[PDB]
C-alpha cells in the first residue's frame, strides 16, 4: 500500500494472507471454509493464514489452513484481467472470533465517491521497493468511471472499478494482489492491477465483487 497508515493489530480481521512459503497476496475471508481472493493469485500449493498482523513473527493470533481447492473464474482473462476473481477453499473451517472475522457479500455494487479501506502487505514505495511485515490500510474512494475509462482506454470492463487518488501518492500496489475494498461494511472490490503504483492519473483497477455475487453463492454452495 503506498502512502496508507499501520492498520492495527487485527483491526481487519477479515484479512487473510495467501503464503507458498512466503506471503505472495492477500485475499479475503467471506464464511468459515472459503476465502475470495484474485485468479492473478493462482498458484498451487496456497495455505491461508488468517489472524495475522506480522507477517514474519507468530505473534499468537494465526490460524494457518490448507486450500482443499481452488476455483478461478470461468470467463477469467489473464491478458486482460477481466473477471480476476477465484476461490479457495479451507481443508478445515476457520475458528471464528474476534481476530478473524468474515466480510459480508454486497446486496449492490457501490456509487462513486464512496469511501473504502484497502489493506494488505504489498510494496509501500512507488519508484521503489519496500516490503511492510504489519498491514497497511488505506482510505480510498471509488472514481466515476469516465475518469476510470480515461486514464486506461479501452481496457476498463464492466466488471472493474478505480479506486485511489488521480493527484497519485496513495494507491494498492503488487503484494495487495487478491486482497479487500470494503465500503459500507460489504467487499466491493478485489485488489487487481493498475499502473505502477500510486502514479498521477493512473489510479487502482479493482474486480467489481457485486456482479459475481451470485456466482460466488452458487459455487460454494455446490463445492
Ligand atoms: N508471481 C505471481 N504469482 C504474482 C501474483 C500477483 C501479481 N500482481 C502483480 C502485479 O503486476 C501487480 N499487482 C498490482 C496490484 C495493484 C497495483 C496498483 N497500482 N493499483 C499494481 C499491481 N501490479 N504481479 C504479480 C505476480
Ligand atoms: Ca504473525
Ligand atoms: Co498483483
Given at each position: 500500500?503506498?502512502?496508507?497508515?499501520?492498520?492495527?493489530?487485527?483491526?481487519?480481521?477479515?484479512?487473510v494472507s495467501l503464503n507458498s512459503g512466503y506471503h505472495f497476496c492477500?485475499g479475503?475471508?467471506?464464511?468459515?471454509?472459503?476465502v475470495?481472493?484474485?485468479?492473478?493469485?493462482?498458484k498451487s500449493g496456497i495455505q491461508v493464514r488468517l489472524?495475522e498482523?506480522?507477517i514474519?513473527?507468530?505473534?499468537?493470533?494465526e490460524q494457518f489452513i490448507s486450500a482443499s481447492?481452488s476455483?478461478?473464474?470461468?470467463?477469467?482473462?489473464?491478458?486482460?484481467?477481466?473477471?480476476?476473481?477465484?476461490?479457495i477453499?479451507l481443508k478445515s473451517?476457520?475458528?471464528?472470533?474476534?481476530?478473524?472475522?468474515?466480510?459480508?457479500?454486497?446486496?449492490?455494487?457501490?456509487?462513486?465517491?464512496?469511501?473504502?479501506?484497502?489493506?494488505?502487505?504489498?510494496?509501500?514505495?512507488?519508484?521503489?521497493?519496500?516490503?511492510?511485515?504489519?498491514?497497511?490500510?488505506?482510505?480510498?474512494?471509488?472514481?466515476?468511471?469516465?475518469?476510470?475509462?480515461?486514464?486506461?482506454?479501452?481496457?476498463?470492463?464492466?466488471?472493474?472499478?478505480?479506486?485511489?487518488?488521480?493527484?497519485?501518492?496513495?494507491?494498492?500496489?503488487?503484494?495487495?494482489?487478491?486482497?479487500?475494498?470494503?465500503?459500507?461494511?460489504?467487499?466491493?472490490?478485489?485488489?487487481?492491477?493498475?499502473?505502477?503504483?500510486?502514479?498521477?492519473?493512473?489510479?487502482?483497477?479493482?474486480?467489481?465483487?457485486?456482479?459475481?455475487?451470485?456466482?460466488?453463492?452458487?459455487?460454494?454452495?455446490?463445492?
Amino acid at each position: 500500500i503506498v502512502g496508507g497508515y499501520t492498520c492495527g493489530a487485527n483491526t481487519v480481521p477479515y484479512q487473510v494472507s495467501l503464503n507458498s512459503g512466503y506471503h505472495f497476496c492477500g485475499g479475503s475471508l467471506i464464511n468459515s471454509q472459503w476465502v475470495v481472493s484474485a485468479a492473478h493469485c493462482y498458484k498451487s500449493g496456497i495455505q491461508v493464514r488468517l489472524g495475522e498482523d506480522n507477517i514474519n513473527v507468530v505473534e499468537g493470533n494465526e490460524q494457518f489452513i490448507s486450500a482443499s481447492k481452488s476455483i478461478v473464474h470461468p470467463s477469467y482473462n489473464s491478458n486482460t484481467l477481466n473477471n480476476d476473481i477465484m476461490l479457495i477453499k479451507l481443508k478445515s473451517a476457520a475458528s471464528l472470533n474476534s481476530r478473524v472475522a468474515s466480510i459480508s457479500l454486497p446486496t449492490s455494487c457501490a456509487s462513486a465517491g464512496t469511501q473504502c479501506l484497502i489493506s494488505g502487505w504489498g510494496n509501500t514505495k512507488s519508484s521503489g521497493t519496500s516490503y511492510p511485515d504489519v498491514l497497511k490500510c488505506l482510505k480510498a474512494p471509488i472514481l466515476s468511471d469516465s475518469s476510470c475509462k480515461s486514464a486506461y482506454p479501452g481496457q476498463i470492463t464492466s466488471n472493474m472499478f478505480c479506486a485511489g487518488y488521480l493527484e497519485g501518492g496513495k494507491d494498492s500496489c503488487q503484494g495487495d494482489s487478491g486482497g479487500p475494498v470494503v465500503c459500507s461494511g460489504k467487499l466491493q472490490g478485489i485488489v487487481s492491477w493498475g499502473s505502477g503504483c500510486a502514479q498521477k492519473n493512473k489510479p487502482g483497477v479493482y474486480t467489481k465483487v457485486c456482479n459475481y455475487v451470485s456466482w460466488i453463492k452458487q459455487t460454494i454452495a455446490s463445492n
